[PDB]
Write an enzyme that holds these catalytic residues in place. Structure first.
Site, PDB file in Angstrom:
ATOM      1  N   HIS A   1       0.857  -1.175   0.000  1.00 35.34           N
ATOM      2  CA  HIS A   1       0.000   0.000   0.000  1.00 35.34           C
ATOM      3  C   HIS A   1       0.896   1.228   0.000  1.00 35.34           C
ATOM      4  CE1 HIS A   1       0.828  -0.963   4.237  1.00 35.34           C
ATOM      5  NE2 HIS A   1       0.995   0.344   4.337  1.00 35.34           N
TER       6      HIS A   1
ATOM      7  N   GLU B   1       6.081   8.590   5.485  1.00 45.71           N
ATOM      8  CA  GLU B   1       6.020   8.414   6.932  1.00 45.71           C
ATOM      9  C   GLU B   1       7.415   8.513   7.550  1.00 45.71           C
ATOM     10  OE1 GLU B   1       3.422   4.797   7.513  1.00 45.71           O
ATOM     11  OE2 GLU B   1       2.075   6.443   8.044  1.00 45.71           O
TER      12      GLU B   1
ATOM     13  N   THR C   1      -0.375   2.282  11.484  1.00 45.29           N
ATOM     14  CA  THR C   1      -1.789   2.521  11.700  1.00 45.29           C
ATOM     15  C   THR C   1      -2.232   1.652  12.862  1.00 45.29           C
ATOM     16  OG1 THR C   1      -2.541   0.757  10.214  1.00 45.29           O
ATOM     17  CG2 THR C   1      -2.148   2.957   9.255  1.00 45.29           C
TER      18      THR C   1
HETATM   19  N1  LIG Z   1       1.548   1.365   7.551  1.00 46.93           N
HETATM   20  S1  LIG Z   1       1.425  -0.288   7.914  1.00 46.93           S
HETATM   21  O1  LIG Z   1       1.667  -0.532   9.335  1.00 46.93           O
HETATM   22  O2  LIG Z   1       2.495  -0.993   7.210  1.00 46.93           O
HETATM   23  C1  LIG Z   1      -0.220  -0.823   7.362  1.00 46.93           C
HETATM   24  C2  LIG Z   1      -0.768  -2.055   7.687  1.00 46.93           C
HETATM   25  C3  LIG Z   1      -2.035  -2.349   7.194  1.00 46.93           C
HETATM   26  N2  LIG Z   1      -2.714  -3.589   7.474  1.00 46.93           N
HETATM   27  C4  LIG Z   1      -2.936  -4.007   8.836  1.00 46.93           C
HETATM   28  O3  LIG Z   1      -2.532  -3.361   9.747  1.00 46.93           O
HETATM   29  N3  LIG Z   1      -3.665  -5.247   8.986  1.00 46.93           N
HETATM   30  C5  LIG Z   1      -3.994  -5.897  10.239  1.00 46.93           C
HETATM   31  C6  LIG Z   1      -3.195  -5.753  11.365  1.00 46.93           C
HETATM   32  C7  LIG Z   1      -3.544  -6.417  12.535  1.00 46.93           C
HETATM   33  C8  LIG Z   1      -4.677  -7.225  12.565  1.00 46.93           C
HETATM   34  C9  LIG Z   1      -5.095  -7.956  13.840  1.00 46.93           C
HETATM   35  F1  LIG Z   1      -4.034  -8.602  14.401  1.00 46.93           F
HETATM   36  F2  LIG Z   1      -5.613  -7.055  14.728  1.00 46.93           F
HETATM   37  F3  LIG Z   1      -6.050  -8.875  13.511  1.00 46.93           F
HETATM   38  C10 LIG Z   1      -5.467  -7.366  11.433  1.00 46.93           C
HETATM   39  C11 LIG Z   1      -5.123  -6.706  10.269  1.00 46.93           C
HETATM   40  C12 LIG Z   1      -2.745  -1.459   6.406  1.00 46.93           C
HETATM   41  O4  LIG Z   1      -4.021  -1.813   5.937  1.00 46.93           O
HETATM   42  C13 LIG Z   1      -2.184  -0.237   6.095  1.00 46.93           C
HETATM   43  N4  LIG Z   1      -2.887   0.718   5.270  1.00 46.93           N
HETATM   44  O5  LIG Z   1      -2.668   1.871   5.394  1.00 46.93           O
HETATM   45  O6  LIG Z   1      -3.804   0.254   4.318  1.00 46.93           O
HETATM   46  C14 LIG Z   1      -0.929   0.075   6.581  1.00 46.93           C
HETATM   47 ZN   LIG Z   2       2.023   1.603   5.617  1.00 46.03          ZN
END
Ligand SMILES: NS(=O)(=O)c1cc(NC(=O)Nc2ccc(C(F)(F)F)cc2)c(O)c([N+](=O)[O-])c1
Ligand SMILES: [Zn+2]
Length: 257
Positions: free
Chosen positions: A91, A103, A196
Site C-alpha cells: 500500500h 512516513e 496505523t
Molecule cells: N503502515 S502499515 O503498518 O504498514 C499498514 C498495515 C495495514 N494492514 C494491517 O494493519 N492489517 C492488520 C493488522 C492487525 C490485525 C489484527 F491482528 F488485529 F487482527 C489485522 C489486520 C494497512 O491496511 C495499512 N494501510 O494503510 O492500508 C498500513
Molecule cells: Zn504503511
C-alpha cells in the site's frame, strides 16, 4: 473511529490504542550521520518472480494490493531477517502536496509518498499470529519523489477510478511488484511497529536508501481517492501518513557506508 482528520487523527490514537506511546513505535526520522554501518548485515533477497496478485481494495485509509500468501510464492529473506517472510499486500501513504507524504523521513526530509510492502514470518503459520510476535512482520519501505513517470506503477494508477470510495474492490491479477523496486537494495533497518492502529510493535523495518521517481500526474491520481464510502460527503484521501515518533532506546543500522 480513527482516521487522519482533525478530530480522529494520529494525535488522538493513543486514547483507543495506548501502545501509540510505546517503546518501538514507527515511523521515525532517519539521521544519516548517527545511523551505524553494520558489516554483519546480509544483502536483501527479494524473490518476487512467482508473485500472484489478487485484487485491489479501498479500505477507507489507503488502497491495498493483496497477494496469494498460501504458499511461498513471493518472499523476502536475507538482510537482518532470520527465516522466510511472505508478501501479503502492499500500500502507499501520500500527501496533499509534493513536499509531504512519506512516513519515514531522512535527515528531516519528507518525500511525496512511501510504498510499504508487508511480509509475514512463515514460522508463525498465519498473518494473525505473526502480528503478535516481535519478529512477526518485515515491511519494505520505498520512498517516492516526483519526477519521471514510473512505468511499472501505471497499471495501479489506471484502476484507481474503479475503487474510488471506501469498501470498493477490483480484480487485480498478474501485477508484477518487481516493477516498483529501485535499482539498489541498500537499506536502513530498525525494529518498529505498524503505523496505523492497532500499532502493534511487531515489525522489522527495512527502508531503502534509493527512492523511485513517479510523475506529477501519477501522484495526482492517488489524491483523487475518497476516504468516505459511496453516497457519503466526499473527503479526498490525502495526508494518510503518521508523523515521526521518538526513537527512544533504538539504533538505526545501515547496510552501507
Ligand atoms: N503502515 S502499515 O503498518 O504498514 C499498514 C498495515 C495495514 N494492514 C494491517 O494493519 N492489517 C492488520 C493488522 C492487525 C490485525 C489484527 F491482528 F488485529 F487482527 C489485522 C489486520 C494497512 O491496511 C495499512 N494501510 O494503510 O492500508 C498500513
Ligand atoms: Zn504503511
Amino acid at each position: 473511529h480513527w482516521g487522519y482528520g482533525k478530530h480522529n487523527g494520529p494525535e488522538h490514537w493513543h486514547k483507543d490504542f495506548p501502545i501509540a506511546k510505546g517503546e518501538r513505535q514507527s515511523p521515525v526520522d532517519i539521521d544519516t550521520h548517527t545511523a551505524k554501518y553494520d558489516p554483519s548485515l546480509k544483502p536483501l533477497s527479494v524473490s518476487y518472480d512467482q508473485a500472484t496478485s489478487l485484487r485491489i481494495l479501498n479500505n477507507g485509509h489507503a488502497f491495498n494490493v493483496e497477494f496469494d500468501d498460501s504458499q511461498d510464492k513471493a518472499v523476502l529473506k536475507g538482510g537482518p531477517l532470520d527465516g522466510t517472510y511472505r508478501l501479503i499486500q502492499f500500500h502507499f501513504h501520500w500527501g496533499s502536496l509534493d513536499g509531504q507524504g512519506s512516513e519515514h523521513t531522512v535527515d528531516k526530509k519528507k518525500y511525496a509518498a512511501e510504498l510499504h510492502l508487508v511480509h509475514w514470518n512463515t514460522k508463525y503459520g498465519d498473518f494473525g499470529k505473526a502480528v503478535q510476535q516481535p519478529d512477526g512482520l518485515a515491511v519494505l519501505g520505498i520512498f517516492l519523489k516526483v519526477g519521471s513517470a514510473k512505468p511499472g506503477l501505471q497499471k495501479v494508477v489506471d484502476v484507481l477510478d474503479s475503487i474510488k470510495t471506501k469498501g470498493k474492490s477490483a480484480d487485480f491479477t498478474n501485477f508484477d511488484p518487481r516493477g516498483l523496486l529501485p535499482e539498489s537494495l541498500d537499506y536502513w533497518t530498525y525494529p518498529g511497529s505498524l503505523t496505523t492502529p492497532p500499532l502493534l510493535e511487531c515489525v522489522t523495518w527495512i527502508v531503502l536508501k534509493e527512492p523511485i521517481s513517479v510523475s506529477s500526474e501519477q501522484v495526482l491520481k492517488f489524491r483523487k481517492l475518497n476516504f468516505n464510502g459511496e453516497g457519503e460527503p466526499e473527503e479526498l484521501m490525502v495526508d494518510n501518513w503518521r508523523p515521526a515518533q521518538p526513537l527512544k532506546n533504538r539504533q538505526i543500522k545501515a547496510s552501507f557506508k
